Design a protein around this nucleic acid. Structure first.
Ligand SMILES: [Mg+2]
Ligand SMILES: [Mg+2]
Ligand SMILES: [Mg+2]
Ligand SMILES: [Mg+2]
Ligand SMILES: [Mn+2]
Ligand SMILES: [Mn+2]
Ligand SMILES: [Mn+2]
Ligand SMILES: [Mn+2]
Lengths: 458, 458
DNA sequence: GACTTGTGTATAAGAGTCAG
DNA sequence: CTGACTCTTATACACAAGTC
DNA sequence: GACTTGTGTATAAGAGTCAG
DNA sequence: CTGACTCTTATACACAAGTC
């Protein structure tokens, strides 16, 4: 694991970039490390006062000989490298936009109405997770494009995104593709997409949107499914949250436990006369005034038993990870905070950030246990200092010196107060905590050094 | 000076609050220290994981027995205390708004159109500076109010703000009022205001807005002034900046040197037949396409010689400090980032922040020299660590171990790269640097401690 | 003296944000 | 697109420490 | 070998933000 | 309300270190 040490991390992710000059590759690694060390901050701040590094970083982000595609490819190859270690993987796939309003926006693509000031890119990503513990492995692919003002000018239909993602995946994963399960939201409810996966014997979990007919029974998927015997079901704890509409009316969404029934079955679609499985999760005795929870999922996976169908549900529930990634890239890494003047420059910088973003998520996961000493992830110095810092804050529930303790102590460092008592700290708080730990390490290490050379302190 | 040590700072500013219970007073001090230590962050983060402190802080901000007015008064009394030390003071006076859009906004006052979602308060402040070195002393007064949707419902004209500010000032400053020079923008070009100052024999510098006539010559102030002989003049370096209009068109404002002529004279206004002086600064051979620089200032101060008139100009140029304060309160302390649910709660919290804001400015000023050792402001440990940290970053121009060095080293810590080569770091960068210093101090001090108890490190 | 009010610890949840 | 949090405002108890 | 391209140091300034 | 900055993109030189 090259994660905690930014520099090592950077090297692991980008050392193989094929930029056409070993010098650009080394710079990319260096640029990425500083950004990673100063997650979310500006290039300048990341430079720690080094003129040369600052100049180096800017020169690189505007280097017309550096391909952003090649930079994203490099990091993707590392994900592939890492993926060899797991028998089953989840390929989470979704689209987001990168929005800007500064001068360059004029040179970017449409995101809303033709007149909107905010313009930028649509980015279709594939986020790989290991299917046993669901940890985040890394990005596998990104497709970036600018939507034209006039659809007529489009080079191709955007719906082809899924398929291009699959082609890239399959080619980067080679013989590992068989261990991959593609996870997509309703937008992927495209028969052409389904056909293709099936044709390659590839795996997937796609939520259904359209009313489709089941060839055998001739009923609509939903109906055919309602006819299937209940397998059992499951419960979900829906947490409280405040809600605001399009108009800005605010209202509360109190917490609640939802009970769902689970049914599954085999279906067949006319298109290519393809066969696949389906699962239907639907809320029983839904509240008086709430929109019932309902998921109709299409899949390649087994669904016969309650266990197999629930497995499908668990898989689809992991799709949300990509949403966290979106936020980590934006709010976390600062994707939309960048102010490069030319599309290509901004693209280069932002591409690097996509990796920083995945790291933000991994950091947290690294502190998340499945009683494993904290010494497994931290240095002895990190340990010592942390202990010092946490003095007296440890709760009974936390085994002294454990991985669990390190997690809370770091979060605490980050301000975490477990307000809802879930025990779960945000990836933002954890980063905040780690950042503080690291900062304080510098001071600690500075003292240590001075003593080592017989120097008196203060 | 109780500035650098947050706690001591808090005590100095608020220890005399008259809250009706010594317990609320001690809490206020404590609340303020944590906020000051964690400038700009949330109450929770400021709590360093302490449930009791967090609970204490919230309880206080919603305590119906705590008067926000009393909290602002307390800090103002400290400014008064401090003011005794200077022979001449500048009372900078201006209005800003505090804007919110969350649920409470409905309970706040109008700031724009009757329908605007953003509502909140208008706050008229007096910011005291020492007139020799222009350092920031502190806040002297704040008047907060909610503007009614219908003017008809207003309790009084908002124009009375200046006068109420003067009444409060005079009463808090007592015999020191004579050393005070009131500094106000054109909005203060109110004859009733002028009369009042004059009547109390009080001093001021008010920019002129309206065309007024000079009783003696019977010409308009501007004209009468143009007739006065030129005293000499002055130059200004107008720096480059990007500019954006109301509509969002962006355009450059390149740097330039402006040459101004200076004239002065005595004038008399019909209202109360009052006499006062005036100065007129007007740009000579102004550029082809720029809006000419022009200041017509009304004052109590001497204007006869070039020196005396320039003095007036320098004074008025210091008005901008209040603008920095506005930003420090908002962007810096987080005034508008607060999300308290009731007007009174938000008011209490935000009132505390106004002091935090002044401190942000003072911090910087504290590192600003007029070759005074850094040891005058920093601890030996702070010094040592800082030196360690800055290793190799010092520029020749900076005398090793000086106040000047500490300034740059801290700024550097804050990311400063002197992009425009002015040599001046923002108050934001300086805080960032100080914050880092402090953070790193914790680690340093933690090491020091451990050694002291024979413990091996890492 | 007779009553309130704050604190440190507990429990719980509404309000607000940026991802959808 | 079946969310995941933090900020903010309560509630309760056994004291402490305030007011009038 | 014959030409480009990056680096560390320099100089300068346009673009963008939140205060007005 | 006569702004004060940081972020970002150049320019130039003497080398170094790349490509083809
Ligand atoms: Mg295989
Ligand atoms: Mg931080
Ligand atoms: Mg006097
Ligand atoms: Mg900071
Ligand atoms: Mn989607
Ligand atoms: Mn004003
Ligand atoms: Mn999405
Ligand atoms: Mn103003």
């Amino acid at each position: 694991s090259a994660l905690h040490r930014a520099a090592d991390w950077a090297k692991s992710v980008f050392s193989s970039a094929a930029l056409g000059d070993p010098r650009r590759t080394a710079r990319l690694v260096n640029v990425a490390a500083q950004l990673a060390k100063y997650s979310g901050k500006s290039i300048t701040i990341s430079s720690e006062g080094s003129k040369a590094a600052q100049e180096g970083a800017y020169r690189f982000i505007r280097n017309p000989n550096v391909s952003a595609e090649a930079i994203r490819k490099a990091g993707a190859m590392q994900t592939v490298k890492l993926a060899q270690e797991f028998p089953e993987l989840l390929a989470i796939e979704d689209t987001t936009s990168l929005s800007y309003r500064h001068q360059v926006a004029e040179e970017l693509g449409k995101l809303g109405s033709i007149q909107k000031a905010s313009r930028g890119w649509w980015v279709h990503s594939v986020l790989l997770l290991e299917a046993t513990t669901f940890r985040t492995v890394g990005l596998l692919h990104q497709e970036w494009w600018m939507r034209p003002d006039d659809p007529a000018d489009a080079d191709e239909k955007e719906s082809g995104k899924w398929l291009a993602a699959a082609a890239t995946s399959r080619l980067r994963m080679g013989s590992m593709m068989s261990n991959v399960i593609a996870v997509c939201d309703r937008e992927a409810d495209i028969h052409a997409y389904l056909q293709d996966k099936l044709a390659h014997n590839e795996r997937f979990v796609v939520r259904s949107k359209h009313p489709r007919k089941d060839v055998e029974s001739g009923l609509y998927l939903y109906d055919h499914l309602k006819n299937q015997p209940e397998l059992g079901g499951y419960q979900i704890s829906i947490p409280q949250k405040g809600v605001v509409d399009k108009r800005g009316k605010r209202k509360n969404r109190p917490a609640r436990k939802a009970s769902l029934s689970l049914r599954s079955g085999r279906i067949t679609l006319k298109q290519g006369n393809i066969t696949l499985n389906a699962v239907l999760a639907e809320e029983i005795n839904p509240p008086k005034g709430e929109t019932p929870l309902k998921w109709l999922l299409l899949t390649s996976e087994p669904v016969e038993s309650l266990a197999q169908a629930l497995r499908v549900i668990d898989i689809y529930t992991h799709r949300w990870r990509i949403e966290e990634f979106h936020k980590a890239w934006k709010t976390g890494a600062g994707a939309e905070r960048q102010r490069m003047e030319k599309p290509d420059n901004l693209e280069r910088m932002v591409s690097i950030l996509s990796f920083v973003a995945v790291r933000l998520l991994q950091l947290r996961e690294s502190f998340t246990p499945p009683s494993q000493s904290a010494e497994t992830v931290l240095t002895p110095d990190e340990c010592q200092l942390l202990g010092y810092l946490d003095k007296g804050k440890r709760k009974r529930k936390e085994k002294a010196g454990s991985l669990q303790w390190a997690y809370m102590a770091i979060a605490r460092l980050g301000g975490f107060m477990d307000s809802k008592r879930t025990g779960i700290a945000s990836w933002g708080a954890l980063w905040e905590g780690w950042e503080a730990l690291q900062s304080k390490l510098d001071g600690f290490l500075a003292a240590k050094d001075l003593m080592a050379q017989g120097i008196k302190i203060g």
